[PDB]
RNA sequence: UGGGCCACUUUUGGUAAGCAGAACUGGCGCUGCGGGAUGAACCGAACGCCGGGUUAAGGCGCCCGAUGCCGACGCUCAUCA
RNA sequence: GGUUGGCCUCGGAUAGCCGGUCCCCCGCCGGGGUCCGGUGCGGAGUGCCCUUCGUCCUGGGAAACGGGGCGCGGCCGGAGAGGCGGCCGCCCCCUCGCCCGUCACGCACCGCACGUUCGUGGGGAACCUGGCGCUAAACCAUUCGUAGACGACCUGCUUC
């Protein structure tokens, strides 16, 4: 199961599309809506416990921010990273106070 | 463990072969693979059978081995075995068998509507024994 | 009885199984071995075969046929055959009745399933 | 309705597919008309298993059915209106049947003749 | 209201190792595994009941897409039920691991 | 029969149960193999090494990418044995290969299943007890399989998983015979009926 | 037609040869079919087009028809069987 | 185009197995030792479970604590491919179905095949019908040079 935070930011949905100039950005839009309505929050938090008891592996998706580098790439760089060291349920709270 | 032995007298059935489910006594053992054997009381004249066919059962006859067929008889007769086997569970749930493969169509209708209403009254208790057990509020 | 042509009369008792008077072929049955003493019943005379035969209507006067015979569809069960069927199971609904639960088991449908075979089955 | 043969045995044929010649499928110069392959090293010619099949007597039809048409009769070619009446008296194994270059006039008149004559023509409407 | 057939199985053509004679064709039916016991079946009728796409007429039923290849039971194939049987028009080879009825026709029992 | 075979590999002789399944599966017969690391091997565990070592070398030299594809898992082993013994080249050997499914431990589409056993190929009928034999799980370890310790804590949750299940159906199982004590007045004319003709003994 | 070749046995030269040369019979050449996985010659058997039955030689785990016999008695473990 | 009831599961040993019970120990269920049975496996896959002609009078038995409602709502369990299974509250009916009897009826289609299921099957367009929802990208063209024979690949393109 993969969970993302809410406000991701837009260098980050830059990576997500091929041609930005010409979306209108929808990325993602009516996934942050569950992160605010009661609803989805019971989803959100039954997801992460899912995880926690189901999973061995778990891994933090990271993006780098493009708007302090000197290149004229605007597009962030996404990859997993695989948090070691823990049992998994204290690896799981270790990611979700990094997310966002 | 091993609590039944290929000894003089011992009772064997026949479970495949000329004289298949037929009862048998072992008068002697020659060469760890035929046994001369000897059904006086059960329609199985003297001769020697392989110890593949038999199946050895917890009835045991004291008489000498290679004994004539009048001794191997009085030893049957006395003790009589057709009566503790046949009589025995073993055989009365081979005759079970055999009376289930010579059941009619009419008896399997029969069977099948006794059937259905004995599991119907099965059924129905356990249900009643499974609510009248549930009912347990103790700490 | 079986007929002079070889076919063999037989009965559902009607009110049982819905087979009424009507002819079968040996051939295509299977005896089973279940038998009532129906000694001492009397089969009518005139059950032969010629009573048995299929009628016809078609066609009287006419050669090519645009107006159909819109009649006839419904085979009619003749005043006649009621009765010589009310003769007979008559005299053999008591027969039946005798024997514990014959009337369950003519009212029932031979059929096989995913378990027993034909060539083992004793009928 | 049409004209019954005298008698209809049922027509018994030993082989109904065509004996194609030899790699006539693999050409177009080799046309499907059988020749006998006399070659030192052909398979068909040794008669080898799963190969085209070489024809021979033994295929031959019956006495009794040989040249007999699917519907109990036997052919024969009239050219006008004489030619019909020698198959007044046969009448019942033979049929006659029209040669394709009789004009639409004059196939119209064996026509009528042999409906008269209760002779059975294979091609009766071929020139409407 | 019943399956009143036995389900046998349609295993191949009576064949050599490199010749096959689409004349006959083996059964194999279920629940007999000895030649001792296909003498019950031994002139019972078979059917390959198949559908196409045509609608074709039935025998006492509206025209619909089922259709049958009829045939017999012959004789016993070897030690081991394995019934041959012979149909009116040899079997299509794509019928072969598919099913076949025995009808319980003609009867001896 | 129109359902599923389903066949427990362990205890099973590699070749004598392909053999059983490749001829099952030509017959139609839709057949599952499962727990197919416990399928056995006749002889010591060394000379079976060396066999599929001796496979393993057998490689297409200009090209191994096309050449022998050595799978590792006994699942895909087993599958192979029964390739080997179906017309896999022939419309009909594909319809049949594709029949058969083959899994390592028990998939939780049939550990919720009763699996058939087929004595002719088991070991224990088939082998003299003197005798040597290789696991199919052990010898796939050691020649490339990944995943034999992952199975093993699967295999082993599922057979806790399965003594619960089986702990309840002996408590089903006393209750109905204790009903059938309760219930006796009222069933001994029927149980009777069903004595006379050979059921319940 | 007057290039032959092969097999059993006999046999000459040669270390030997799927070599060279003889004797007898059979075969291939000129010949398809069943078996030996494959094969001019080996084993069976020679051939018109078909249906039924039965065999030969050879086989009957699966490929692949047939042992899915409750086959019989032994022998054998091979880290190149 | 197939098919012509289901089996919803211990682990295993094989020179041994299976079931049941009284006392010890594991935060009123599990594990040990006694004891009792069965073992050519009968708590048996050579097995078990459903079983279909349908109704109307008409009694005796099983039950009455019940069933069936894709009727509703909730809860719990299942992750190895969970695509599943189970449990409570509400509302509709009736003592209907299961066994043995009484009673008669149904197209009884005049001997005949492909009958009987899964099944409201899968796939593709199309009409009508109501309710609830959403308003996107890809490629080209243009740039880039972290790339490049050409394709491909890495990039940018009205807002702070
Ligand atoms: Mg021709
Ligand atoms: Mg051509
Ligand atoms: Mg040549
Ligand atoms: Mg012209
Ligand atoms: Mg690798
Ligand atoms: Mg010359
Ligand atoms: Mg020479
Ligand atoms: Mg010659
Ligand atoms: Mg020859
Ligand atoms: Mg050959
Ligand atoms: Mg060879
Ligand atoms: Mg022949
Ligand atoms: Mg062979
Ligand atoms: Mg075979």
């Known amino acids: 199961k993969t969970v993302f935070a809410e406000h991701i930011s837009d260098e980050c949905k830059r990576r997500f599309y091929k041609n930005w100039h010409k979306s209108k950005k929808k990325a993602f839009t009516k996934y942050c809506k569950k992160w605010q309505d009661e609803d989805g929050k019971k989803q959100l938090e039954k997801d992460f416990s899912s995880m926690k008891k189901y999973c061995q592996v778990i891994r933090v998706i990271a993006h780098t921010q493009m708007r302090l580098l000197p290149l004229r790439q605007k597009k962030a760089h996404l990859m997993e990273i695989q948090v070691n060291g823990g049992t998994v349920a204290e690896k799981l709270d270790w990611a979700r106070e990094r997310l966002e | 463990v091993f609590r039944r032995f290929v000894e003089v007298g011992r009772v064997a059935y026949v479970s495949f072969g000329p004289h298949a489910g037929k009862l048998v006594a072992i008068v002697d053992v020659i060469d760890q693979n035929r046994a001369l054997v000897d059904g006086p009381c059960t329609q199985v004249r003297r001769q020697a059978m392989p110890f593949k066919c038999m199946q050895l059962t917890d009835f045991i006859l004291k008489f000498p081995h290679s004994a004539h067929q009048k001794y191997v008889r009085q030893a049957w007769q006395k003790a009589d075995i057709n009566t503790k086997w046949a009589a025995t569970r073993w055989a009365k749930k081979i005759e079970a068998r055999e009376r289930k493969a010579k059941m009619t169509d009419f008896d399997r209708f029969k069977v099948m509507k006794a059937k259905k209403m004995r599991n119907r009254i099965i059924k129905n208790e356990v249900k009643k024994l499974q609510k009248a057990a549930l009912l347990k509020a103790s700490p | 009885k079986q007929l002079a042509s070889g076919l063999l009369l037989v009965t559902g008792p009607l009110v049982l199984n819905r087979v009424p008077l009507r002819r079968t072929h040996q051939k295509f049955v299977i005896a089973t071995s279940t038998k009532i003493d129906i000694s001492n019943v009397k089969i009518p005379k005139h059950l032969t075969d010629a009573y048995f035969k299929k009628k016809k209507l078609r066609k009287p006067r006419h050669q090519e046929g645009e107006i159909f015979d819109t009649e006839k569809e419904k085979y009619e069960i003749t005043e006649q055959r009621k009765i010589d069927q009310k003769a007979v199971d008559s005299q053999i609904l008591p027969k039946i009745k005798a024997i514990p639960q014959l009337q369950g088991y003519l009212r029932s449908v031979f059929a096989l399933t995913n378990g027993i075979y034909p060539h083992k089955l004793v009928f | ?128 | 209201s019943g399956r009143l057939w036995s389900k046998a199985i349609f295993a191949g053509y009576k064949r050599g190792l490199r010749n096959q004679r689409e004349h006959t064709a083996l059964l194999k039916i279920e629940g007999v595994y000895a030649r001792d016991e296909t003498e019950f079946y031994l002139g019972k009728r078979c059917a390959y009941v198949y559908k196409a796409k045509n609608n074709t007429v039935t025998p006492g039923g509206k025209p619909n897409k089922t259709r049958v290849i009829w045939g017999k039971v012959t004789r016993a194939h070897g030690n081991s039920g394995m019934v041959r049987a012979k149909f009116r028009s040899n079997l299509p080879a794509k019928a072969i691991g598919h099913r076949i009825r025995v009808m319980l026709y003609p009867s001896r029992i | 029969e129109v359902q599923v075979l389903v066949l427990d590999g362990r205890g099973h002789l590699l070749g004598r149960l392909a053999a059983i399944v490749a001829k099952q599966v030509l017959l139609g017969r839709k057949v599952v193999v499962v727990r197919c690391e416990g399928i056995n091997i006749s002889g010591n565990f060394y000379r079976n090494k060396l066999k599929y070592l001796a496979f393993l070398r057998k490689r297409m030299n200009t090209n191994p990418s096309r050449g022998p594809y050595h799978f590792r898992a006994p699942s895909r082993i087993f599958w192979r044995t029964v390739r080997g013994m179906l017309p896999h080249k022939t419309k009909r050997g594909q319809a049949a290969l594709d029949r058969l499914k083959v899994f390592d431990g028990i998939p939780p589409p049939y550990d919720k299943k009763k699996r058939m056993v087929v004595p002719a190929a088991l070991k224990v009928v088939r082998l003299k007890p003197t005798r040597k034999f290789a696991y199919l799980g052990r010898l796939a370890h050691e020649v490339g399989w990944k995943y034999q310790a992952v199975t093993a804590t699967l295999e082993e949750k599922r057979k806790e998983k399965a003594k619960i299940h089986y702990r309840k159906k002996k408590q089903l199982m006393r209750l109905r015979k204790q009903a059938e004590k309760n219930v006796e007045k009222k069933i001994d004319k029927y149980t009777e009926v069903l004595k006379t003709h050979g059921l319940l003994v």
């Open chain 4, 1 to 128: 309705a049409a004209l019954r043969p005298l008698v209809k045995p049922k027509i018994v044929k030993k082989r109904t597919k065509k004996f194609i010649r030899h790699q006539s499928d693999r050409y177009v110069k080799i046309k499907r008309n059988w020749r006998k392959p006399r070659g030192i090293d052909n398979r068909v010619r040794r008669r080898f298993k799963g190969q085209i099949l070489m024809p021979n007597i033994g295929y031959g039809s019956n006495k009794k059915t040989k040249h007999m048409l699917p519907s109990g009769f036997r052919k024969f070619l009239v050219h006008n209106v004489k030619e019909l009446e020698v198959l007044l008296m046969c009448n019942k194994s033979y049929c006659a049947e029209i040669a394709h270059n009789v004009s639409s006039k004059n196939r119209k008149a064996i026509v009528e003749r042999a409906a008269q004559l209760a002779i059975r023509v294979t091609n009766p409407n071929a020139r409407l």
